[PDB]
Amino acid sequence: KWTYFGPDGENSWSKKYPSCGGLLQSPIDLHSDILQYDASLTPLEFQGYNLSANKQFLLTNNGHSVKLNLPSDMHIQGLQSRYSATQLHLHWGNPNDPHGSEHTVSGQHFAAELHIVHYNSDLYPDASTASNKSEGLAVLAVLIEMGSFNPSYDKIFSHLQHVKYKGQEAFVPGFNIEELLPERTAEYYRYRGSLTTPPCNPTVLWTVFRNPVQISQEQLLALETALYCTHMDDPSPREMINNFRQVQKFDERLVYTSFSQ
Amino acid sequence: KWTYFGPDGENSWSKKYPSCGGLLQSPIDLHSDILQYDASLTPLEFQGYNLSANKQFLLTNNGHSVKLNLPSDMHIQGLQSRYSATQLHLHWGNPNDPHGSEHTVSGQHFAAELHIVHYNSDLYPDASTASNKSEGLAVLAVLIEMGSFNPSYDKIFSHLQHVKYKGQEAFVPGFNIEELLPERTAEYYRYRGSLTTPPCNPTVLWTVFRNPVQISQEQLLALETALYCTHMDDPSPREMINNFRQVQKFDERLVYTSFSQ
Ligand SMILES: NS(=O)(=O)c1ccc(C(=O)Cn2cnc3ccccc32)cc1Cl
Ligand SMILES: NS(=O)(=O)c1ccc(C(=O)Cn2cnc3ccccc32)cc1Cl
Ligand SMILES: [Zn+2]
Ligand SMILES: [Zn+2]
């Protein structure tokens, strides 16, 4: 029952999940020495991201994050296969230290991080099959800073008190997922890595957008206080806080940038 | 046996050394939100650091770092118990990413880091015995950055070519080890933590000096390029680079500082 704190926390995940001790792990610190501009990193296009407000999508507390399931007609155009959406979720810190992004930039954490997970739908039938397989996943990561209130993220956060405990599910009306992405999505970091959670398979094509988005302190506080890793009837409740992995050694990788400066 | 890369790297240390997945792990990021001035933190005194130039001290390559053996009449005064020296060694990065300290400051790595390991000789007979015991160890950590040539560090670095491979040893004539300390040693960070290498026991009283020292670009390159992890006859040599642990989570804790300004 892996966690982010205590005996089953991240320095122990390799005991049960060997790839968490293997190569090509994520997240990483994005810093100058390992950045290289690559002019072939052309813009992604986000197709079928504007989900209908009259449809509804399943939000679930899985005991580790809060996730929204996404429809497979939603895809990224621009990679060398079509990657179709499967879910998005978040990582965050806690009310007294709102600095829980997974990737860091020049050694600094952002307040939180959004991951929109896609799998190679040209090659694989679903994300679970793709996950332990080559070229299987592609994640878009958005760095989140404390700033202005964000009505688009609130389309997710306004439901947190209904998915407070592990296993709980709620429905979120459709909205335009692209509203969760930052300015100038053409500027991104790209690298080969891994799932940042067990089983940590090294099967992810990472795209981290260069620019962060902002959500407010009160939105972060709701995210950091609403949720539990445990079931509603658990007599040992555990708050869902600080659910980010530490950054990983590079293992000789570079990170390629679509921006030269 | 443990390494900083491949499947025996830091994420897997806790399989054979369970304290590497336990409490109070080091190193950590030293940042402003978690610092607190403590007037109780008076200056340490370094006694017996002026090593007889008529004695010789064993330099080894142990496959993890370069280590100089120190005599037990060398000690720190100022802690409640006397802590006697046992050895010093270093941690560093690589020429493509020359930022291999263990501790970080405000998210930033220094180029390298020196540890002068001591043990509580008032309570215990030797460092190995002290290492898994209460109040067992005390380490002085000096952060290193690139700048001026440093003749005192060259009293060690000039012997590196003699300890290129694992198991090799050189004798270093006594010199004043206090020459390796930075300016204004009254200015430091103090916290309770652990060894940064296996077995990672949570038994170290850390003192990280506020101010770094300088070594030249050529000294830093020599430290990064002179050594191998492997024995001389190993048909698959491994360079000794990147021999630092990633920073650990440190939550709901303070680092105390002897300085406020
Ligand atoms: N945080 S992260 O974005 O790196 C991430 C987090 C979870 C998953 C999953 O694919 C979760 N998951 C979904 N189906 C799975 C089957 C086996 C193992 C894990 C599985 C993928 C990713 Cl890419
Ligand atoms: N990097 S570090 O300064 O945290 C450190 C690195 C190594 C050691 C040792 O004492 C290594 N060591 C050497 N012999 C040992 C016997 C038992 C346990 C540890 C032993 C101690 C320390 Cl404190
Ligand atoms: Zn994630
Ligand atoms: Zn050390």
Q: Which amino acid is at B243?
A: N
Backbone angles phi, psi at B128, to 5 degrees: -60, -45
Please state, in angstroms and rounded to a whole number, the distance separating the CA atoms of residues A143 and B37.
Answer: 33
Which residue has 């962060």 as its token pair?
A212
Which residue has 């897997």 as its token pair?
B12
Q: Taking Cα atoms as reference points, which of A17, A3, A7, A16 lies closest to residue A201?
A: A17
Cross-chain Cβ contact A104/B106 below 8 Å: no
Q: Taking Cα atoms as reference points, which of A240, A232, A254, A180 lies closest to residue A211?
A: A180
Please state, in angstroms and rounded to a whole number, the distance separating the CA atoms of residues B131 and B152.
Answer: 29
Please state, in angstroms and rounded to a whole number, the distance separating the CA atoms of residues A163 and A165.
Answer: 6
Please state, in angstroms and rounded to a whole number, the distance separating the CA atoms of residues B104 and A247.
Answer: 13
Please identify, by atom number, the ligand 2 atom nearest to the C-alpha of residue B115.
Answer: 3
Q: Which residues have CB under 6 Å of ligand 1?
A: A 115, 117, 127-128, 131, 137, 139, 195-197, 199, 204
Continuous segment of H or E residues that includes residue A220: helix A217-226
Looking at ligand 1, which residue's alpha carbon is closest to its atom 4? Answer: A195
**In the CATH hierarchy, which top-level class contains the domain A1-261?**
alpha beta
Residue A17 contacts residue A194 (beta carbons within 8 Å): no
Please state, in angstroms and rounded to a whole number, the distance separating the CA atoms of residues A61 and A166.
Answer: 5
**Using beta carbons and an 8 Å cutoff, which residues of B are at the interface with A?**
4-7, 9-15, 20-22, 25, 29, 33, 96-99, 104, 106-109, 242, 246-249, 251-252
Which residue does chain B place closest to A29, by CA atoms?
B107
Considering CB atoms only, which of B6, B248, B251 is closest to A242? B251
Probe residue for ligand 2, chosen from B10, B140, B195, B244 as the CB with the greatest number of ligand atoms within 8 Å: B195
What token pair was written down for A143? 């760095």
DSSP-assigned beta bridge partners for residue A94: A97
3-state secondary structure of A224: helix
Q: Taking Cα atoms as reference points, which of A187, A188, A206, A211 lies closest to residue A196?
A: A206
Please state, in angstroms and rounded to a whole number, the distance separating the CA atoms of residues A242 and B166.
Answer: 40
Please state, in angstroms and rounded to a whole number, the distance separating the CA atoms of residues B206 and B117.
Answer: 10
3-state secondary structure of B113: strand
What token pair was written down for A96? 């007294």
Residue B195 contacts residue B17 (beta carbons within 8 Å): no
Per-residue b or e along B106-119, where b marks 16 or more CB atoms closer than 10 Å to that residue's CB:
ebbbbbbbbbbbbb
Which residue has 């002019």 as its token pair?
A39
Considering CB atoms only, which of B10, B11, B104 is closest to A107? B104
Please state, in angstroms and rounded to a whole number, the distance separating the CA atoms of residues A67 and A16.
Answer: 23
> What CA–CA distances, in Å, run from A10 to A4, A5, B248?
6, 7, 10
Residue A213 contacts residue A182 (beta carbons within 8 Å): yes
Q: What is the DSSP string of A99-150?
A: ---SSEETTEE-SEEEEEEEEETTT-SSHHHHTTSTT-EEEEEEEEEE-S--
Residue A138 contacts residue A207 (beta carbons within 8 Å): yes
Please state, in angstroms and rounded to a whole number, the distance separating the CA atoms of residues A188 and A2.
Answer: 31
Q: How was this structure determined?
A: X-ray
Could you give the angle at the alpha carbon of A91 between the alpha carbons of A87 and A95, nearest 5°? 140
Cross-chain Cβ contact A251/B13 below 8 Å: no
Side-chain half-sphere exposure of A175, counting CA atoms within 13 A: 14
Contacts of A106 in chain B (CB under 8 A): 107-108
Q: Residue A169 burial by CB count (10 A; 0-12/13-18/19+): exposed, middle or buried? A: exposed
> What CA–CA distances, in Å, run from B76 to B121, B125, B130, B137?
11, 16, 16, 11
Backbone angles phi, psi at B219, to 5 degrees: -65, -40
Three-state secondary structure string covering B52-94: CCCCEEEEEECCCCEEEECCCCCEEECCCCCEEEEEEEEEECE
User: Which of B11, B92, B101, B196 to mutate against chain A (most A CBs within 10 Å)?
Assistant: B11
Residue A243 contacts residue A112 (beta carbons within 8 Å): no
What is the DSSP code (8-state) at residue B176? B
Give yes or no for a cis peptide into A95 (omega within 30° of 0).
no
Say which residues have a Cβ less than 8 Å from residue B102's Cβ, sequence separation at least 6: B26, B27, B91, B113, B141, B196, B244, B245, B247
Looking at chain B, list the stretches that DSSP marks H as alpha helix, in order from N- to C-terminal side. Answer: 13-16, 127-130, 151-157, 217-225
CA of B197 to the centre of ligand 2 (A): 7
What is the distance of C-alpha A91 from the center of its chain? 7
Instruction: Please provide the distance, in angstroms rounded to a whole number, between the alpha carbons at the two ends of chain A.
Output: 43
Catalytic residues of B: 64
| Strand ranges across the sheet with B104-105 | B29-30, B104-105, B108-109
CA of A193 to the centre of ligand 3 (A): 12
Please state, in angstroms and rounded to a whole number, the distance separating the CA atoms of residues B254 and B258.
Answer: 13
Please state, in angstroms and rounded to a whole number, the distance separating the CA atoms of residues B114 and B91.
Answer: 7
Side-chain half-sphere exposure of B44, counting CA atoms within 13 A: 28
Which residue does chain A place closest to B3, by CA atoms?
A21
Considering CB atoms only, which of A12, A96, A251 is closest to B14? A12
Q: Residue A148 burial by CB count (10 A; 0-12/13-18/19+): exposed, middle or buried? A: exposed
Three-state secondary structure string covering A147-191: CCCCHHHHHHHCCHHHCCCCCCEEEEECCEHHHHCCCCCCCEEEE
Please identify, by atom number, the ligand 2 atom nearest to the C-alpha of residue B204.
Answer: 23
Q: Residue B260 burial by CB count (10 A; 0-12/13-18/19+): exposed, middle or buried? A: exposed
Q: Where are the beta strands (DSSP E) in chain B?
A: 29-30, 35-37, 45-47, 56-61, 66-69, 75-77, 83-92, 104-105, 108-109, 112-120, 137-146, 169-173, 188-193, 204-209, 213-215, 255-257
Contacts of A11 in chain B (CB under 8 A): 10-11, 13-14, 20-21, 25, 248
Residue A64 is among the residues annotated as catalytic for this protein: yes
Say which residues have a Cβ less than 8 Å from residue A194's Cβ, sequence separation at least 6: A19, A22, A24, A25, A26, A200, A201, A202, A203, A204
> What CA–CA distances, in Å, run from A67 to A117, A166, A171, A196, A207?
10, 11, 11, 15, 19
Cross-chain Cβ contact B96/A33 below 8 Å: yes
Give yes or no for a cis peptide into B27 (omega within 30° of 0).
yes
3-state secondary structure of A86: strand
Residue A163 contacts residue A60 (beta carbons within 8 Å): yes
Considering CB atoms only, which of B108, B242, B249 is closest to A246? B249
Probe residue for ligand 1, chosen from A69, A195, A248 as the CB with the greatest number of ligand atoms within 8 Å: A195
What is the torsion angle, in degrees rounded to the nearest 10, for the CA atoms of residue A12, residue A13, residue A16 and residue A17? Answer: -150
What token pair was written down for B174? 């006594």
Backbone angles phi, psi at A191, to 5 degrees: -160, 165
3-state secondary structure of B165: coil
Question: According to the annotation, is B31 in a ligand binding site?
Answer: no
Q: Could you tell me the residue ranges of all domains in chain A?
A: 1-261
What token pair was written down for A261? 């400066």
Q: Which amino acid is at A247?
A: V
* CA distance to partner chain B, nearest, from residue A125 (Å): 31
Contacts of A109 in chain B (CB under 8 A): 107
* CA distance to partner chain B, nearest, from residue A177 (Å): 32
